Symmetry: C3
Subunit: 114 residues, 3 copies
């Protein structure tokens, strides 16, 4: 790191999302509420796109919720995964794929930038 | 079934989502955590698109959470709805519209497919 | 009000979302489950677009969950924010930015509109 999103990989050619792994081992319990998991991946995103961070279905089904996150086109910070253990104690091992980044078109509008 | 996504219907012409129903009667309690509800609808999706499964607002407000799900362009499995009773006991009757499929453009990138 | 979405503002030029504030002071507890917060902003959306309502990351991290909401292209009602206190008591002050509206392309399909 810092590593750009061009280093992320897709599971398969037809996968919508780019996979995201935590760089740490983390244990989460329901009483902890939302935690921001480090990925060591950084924006910004390709021109005219923004990002959505979503959970992987297999991880959601194992009781780890990823709250959808919006990554702005010009965000240059670290992409973090906002996560919560739903019901039980969840253990995230270093390098496990926990979420996915989806890229979507950024529509321009005349909304004021105030 | 198997039924393709072309069999899904929109509530109205201007509806973003295609409605999804469970093919079973299911009761959900908060302690159960995430459950994958059968729809009997199968991918794949139209060329150059991927799917997002989201909750219907009326169903969310009645205490059933649908976790956002990504449906890859070339997924040929059954589209399932990942769902949780938030606070109370929720009963899903066979044929009730529980979620919606939204289609979005699949942006191509040079990310490796490893 | 009624106020149209053209009155919403972006945090910065590169922000994907248009910010949404509640027009009321609201306290939320976990046992309350989902609440629909008033914004005094109304659809409809620009041609060929639909909307997604998502949480702001800073608000999610402070324990207020926004359930993703789909806003249809031709929705002319009030845009409400579906929200839940995750673990703790959350207080929403009048005018605090609580969610964001993202605009996305509405793909046309031949799905029946029944
Ligand atoms: O899961 C997420 C969500 C957002 N982020 C980063 C990227 C995004 O561009 C940035 C700001 O996100 P939001 O607009 O959702 N957050 P907020 O409204 O609290 O911050 P700001 O006022 O800077 O826009 O936070 C993540 O790293 N992970
Ligand atoms: O709500 C959902 C989410 C995903 N799915 C299916 C369709 C999608 O293409 C497939 C894989 O989804 P994810 O990439 O989110 N899951 P995961 O990363 O666990 O599986 P894989 O390693 O196969 O990519 O699972 C559903 O049926 N419902
Ligand atoms: O967060 C949200 C979600 C939806 N809505 C409004 C806008 C949208 O067009 C409308 C209908 O949303 P859904 O299709 O998700 N709800 P549902 O399927 O329950 O209603 P309908 O049968 O009218 O389509 O509700 C909001 O105001 N906030
Ligand atoms: Mg995957
Ligand atoms: Mg609907
Ligand atoms: Mg913001």
């Amino acid at each position: 790191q810092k590593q750009p999103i061009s280093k992320l990989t897709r599971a398969t050619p037809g996968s919508a999302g780019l996979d995201l792994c935590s760089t740490s081992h983390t244990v989460l319990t329901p009483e902890m509420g939302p935690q921001a998991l480090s990925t060591g991946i950084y924006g910004p995103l390709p021109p005219n796109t923004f990002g959505l961070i979503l959970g992987r279905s297999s991880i959601t089904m194992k009781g780890l919720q990823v709250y959808p996150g919006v990554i702005d086109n010009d965000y240059t910070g670290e992409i973090k995964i906002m996560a919560k253990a739903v019901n039980n104690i969840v253990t995230v091992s270093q390098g496990n794929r926990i979420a996915q980044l989806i890229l979507l078109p950024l529509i321009e509008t005349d909304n004021k930038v105030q």
